[PDB]
Amino acid sequence: DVLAWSWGMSQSGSMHMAGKVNVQDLSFTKYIDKSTPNLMMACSSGKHYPQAKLTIRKAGGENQVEYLIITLKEVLVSSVSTGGSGGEDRLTENVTLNFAQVQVDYQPQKADGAKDGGPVKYGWNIRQNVQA
Amino acid sequence: QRLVRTLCPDCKEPYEADKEQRKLFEPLILYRATGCPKCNHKGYRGRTGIHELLLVDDALQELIHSEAGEQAMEKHIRATTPSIRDDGLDKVRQGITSLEEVMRVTAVDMFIKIGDVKGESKDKTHAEEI
């Protein structure tokens, strides 16, 4: 269960005169659950997973539209930051993810809520620095 | 619900709408009343209904309970349900009733357009922008 997330990229090229893209690691917040030790093991050992898929979905339930799906391939666990306080009932932790490739699929919707056409795709191989 | 007189199909006049008329709703032709022997001698014969179906869902059940108000409730209603006028204007496009008949019974905004990339703006002028 993802409580929050943050991810970005930056282009060094300028129009005042080429550059290169710098894709950041995908950070996300989560509760301390049964996956916590496995992510710490992956971060410590440095063994990457074949795929990691972040899924965002509209408010309502399971039948609502998954309007943003970020798929990652060859994914390391770059860092794990955990902790807690005396007032919290459920403790949380931040986890960052380094990856070779990335695929973002946004699904547009109409006013009523139905899917407006197909999903708009963005794919990029960061390792080879090309489109995917 | 409102009723609107139906333009007689034998004698109605096609005309391109002006700017103020086009703002209500690429040759957009509407139709005018006129008058004639079946038309006898007005621009209409018969009628049809135009509607606006408010459907009370989970969001509207709160607004009624907590007393948000007509305005706040009207704002959420326009997000989901089409208006009375919009249902009438669709029939004007189809060529059933006139625009005269539908009307009688009836913080800074910021947008950006990057090349030919389409966004999701609901604005009338700045449509499909970011």
UniProtKB/Swiss-Prot annotation, chain B:
Top-rank taxon of the source lineage equals Bacteria
List localization entries. Answer: Cell inner membrane
List residues binding Zn(2+). 8, 11, 36, 39
> Phenotype of the disruptant?
Deletion mutants show complete loss of protease secretion.
Q: How does it assemble?
A: Forms homooligomers; most probably hexamers. Interacts with EpsL/GspL.
According to its UniProt entry, the function of this protein is described as: ATPase component of the type II secretion system required for the energy-dependent secretion of extracellular factors such as proteases and toxins from the periplasm. Acts as a molecular motor to provide the energy that is required for assembly of the pseudopilus and the extrusion of substrates generated in the cytoplasm.
Family under the similarity heading: Belongs to the GSP E family.
Identify this protein by name. Type II secretion system ATPase E
Parent-protein start and end of this portion: 390 to 500 of 503
